[PDB]
Amino acid sequence: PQPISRLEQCGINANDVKKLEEAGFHTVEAVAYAPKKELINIKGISEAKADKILAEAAKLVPMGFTTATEFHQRRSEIIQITTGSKELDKLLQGGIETGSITEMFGEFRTGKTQICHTLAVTCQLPIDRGGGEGKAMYIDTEGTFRPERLLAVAERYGLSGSDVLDNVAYARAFNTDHQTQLLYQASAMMVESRYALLIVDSATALYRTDYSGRGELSARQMHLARFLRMLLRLADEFGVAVVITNQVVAQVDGPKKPIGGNIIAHASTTRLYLRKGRGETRICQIYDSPCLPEAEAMFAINADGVGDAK
Amino acid sequence: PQPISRLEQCGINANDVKKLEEAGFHTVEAVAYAPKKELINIKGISEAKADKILAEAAKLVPMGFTTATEFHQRRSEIIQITTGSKELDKLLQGGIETGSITEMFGEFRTGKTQICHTLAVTCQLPIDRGGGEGKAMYIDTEGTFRPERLLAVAERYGLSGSDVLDNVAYARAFNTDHQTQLLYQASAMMVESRYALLIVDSATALYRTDYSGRGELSARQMHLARFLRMLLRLADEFGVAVVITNQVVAQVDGPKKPIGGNIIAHASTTRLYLRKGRGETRICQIYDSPCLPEAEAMFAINADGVGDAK
């Protein structure tokens, strides 16, 4: 990803890119993917500075018709961080892909908050072992972030705890309004240094009670839409894997049906439905993935994170 | 479709047709179907160059009253690419027609992007097998284009993967503004070589979040109208089949009702409502087609694309 200063060398004033920075653009792809009104909304930017900036953004970033063979190549050179459970990796055909959005929902105690802790330490791994050689960042809305589990999985893999903890960045969000500002600050960090995956634990927990619907329902869904649209751009412009978790309602007609509705159902690329088995064993079923066929597999929650039963 | 150079042989200056080209006209039908102000808007074109160009466009393209018998003939010689599921073809009475717009909507996981992957490979087929002997082009707004499925269906039909992948053209759109520029570049390609169908996967996904309505609603609908009007001209002047997909809202009155409103409901010629059955089985119900009576049929999503259950 080319920094936003590379088009400063193409007839753009300095305070212009500086204002784009407070707007939130830090690379040239963030501008090339941006629509016209997103840019015009910046206060102190004309309507012709806009067509110029978009022109050199399109010059520096190819945004036209290619053919399927070149897309097939990149699709083969994606990274797909492993999950730490060999059968889960077989189900996902290699693990959580980079550059897309995954979703994990379930009743409770189903380990959807523990898979995240496992991934946050597995990402720091050489590719010959299933990692991505990049830092993680963790956005929590519940307070359930526990570094004691990262330490256990770090000992499982050999990595030192101090070296896994000069790593995954913690930010606890108190508001649906605060989540988006965290996304801005996260974009800054991800441009200044290399990151492998973002984790939004309970991406929908705060909405359920911030927006007391119905009558507030339409605004809740509109806010979710924008949040997911921002996550999508982060994924597309930084190649990071985005993993979100989701809560569950009880379908009362006379039955889990995760929350969020059609707006999250359409937005998410891959969804994983987690169940409760015997003891530590859990069942993970594939839910809405194009390439992956519908199937399910088993895994366990050990003292070292996601496992196999075991 | 006659190229735009054939009227350059009728008293038109060369830079005139060259400027029509940057305007976007590449055939004589693109000009014959164009209104007067569409042409006057081109900078460097008079108001009399306009009546001239329209005069020889109407000379080269018959645009008057015919009688029903000659329309009945062409209606019988349309192509109607097959879908790859024998019962779906029976429901559609031969498959997706060429020269019109079809629409497929549904909750999620209902295989409306998998039908697109099947069609993108079925189009490259001799007419004695249900194809159209033409390339496809795929416009994606979500990232869900996977050539791994085109490869599977190519093995089902015998065609070689390298020969199905020197084919369907991929372009990922990041903006409602970018979709239209993609349409221009697509018109260029479709005039320079033969194409069979265009696929706009998630034709309405980007609007839902680009235009945060209401107050932006009227502009969103006006942009959709122009996008669909351009698709209609592409279809009419190149005989390609246009297949678009559509998302769904939850009708909250006290219930799917696809998104887009009356502007897409009126514009689309045939609509298909997809449902979720048991396992891989899905149900496809006819929705707003003149000739086709309202009915429904079943089909399955196999490891080789759309099937039959099976």
Add this chain to the structure above:
Amino acid sequence: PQPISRLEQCGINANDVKKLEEAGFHTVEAVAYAPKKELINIKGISEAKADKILAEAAKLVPMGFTTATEFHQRRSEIIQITTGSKELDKLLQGGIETGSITEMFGEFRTGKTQICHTLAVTCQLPIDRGGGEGKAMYIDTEGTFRPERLLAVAERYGLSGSDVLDNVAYARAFNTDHQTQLLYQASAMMVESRYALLIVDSATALYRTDYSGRGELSARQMHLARFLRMLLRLADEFGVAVVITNQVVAQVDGPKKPIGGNIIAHASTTRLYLRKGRGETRICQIYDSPCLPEAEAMFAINADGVGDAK
């Protein structure tokens, strides 16, 4: 309707009537109903040739005060083609009258494009069966003309398909500018031979996207006004029935309200609001007719056109 040559026998030069012909006048009523400036606008016509031509036009066409009894007679000898559904005919008190404008609007799939296909074949019928013994002409702006339905209704009534298809004339319009030229060519045909009804399917579909308002709204409405004024003269001077269809917007105040505004609302004589019932059943409600009281009735869309449920 007397041809325009009958006043050529009253001291008018031949090239004068020939120029009136390119102007668009083909009968003496087209001139008697024409205002003065309509005629003066013809290039190569003086201002005294005008008062002369108007003088003998008024001599040949009575345009003064009559009394109500003689109007009551013609009102009783109008034709009112049937619709093909006995309850619809009871609602309309005999069907679609000749010499006026009717309007049918609705969301979509409501059969307003199928009633037109039924009428286009019902018009070719002896008066003792509800027809008008005249050809039809169909102006399409969407491409939804299907002779396969005319064939089905022709088999329902006994008439042979080849004899219903040496009949209804098809012309597809691509522009609001092209609609009017089609009207001119239609006037020529209707004077050279007998016609019973004109059908403008989607009379307002092209305006919604040709005129991107507001700022273009006032011009859009002015163009609609002229189009409807020309339809009115066609109806008055040829006794044909004019049936137009109309799309729908969503009334957003906090609700269908067809498009076109006060200009089409005032111009249309009778309006029919179509709804969606169960299965094939639809509901047709009377909307703005002087003589007809407000009421509604049911009908169905069968494999042979408009029906009864059935």
Add this chain to the structure above:
DNA sequence: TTTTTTTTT
């Protein structure tokens, strides 16, 4: 004059 959006327990 023009333009629909949004599930929860």
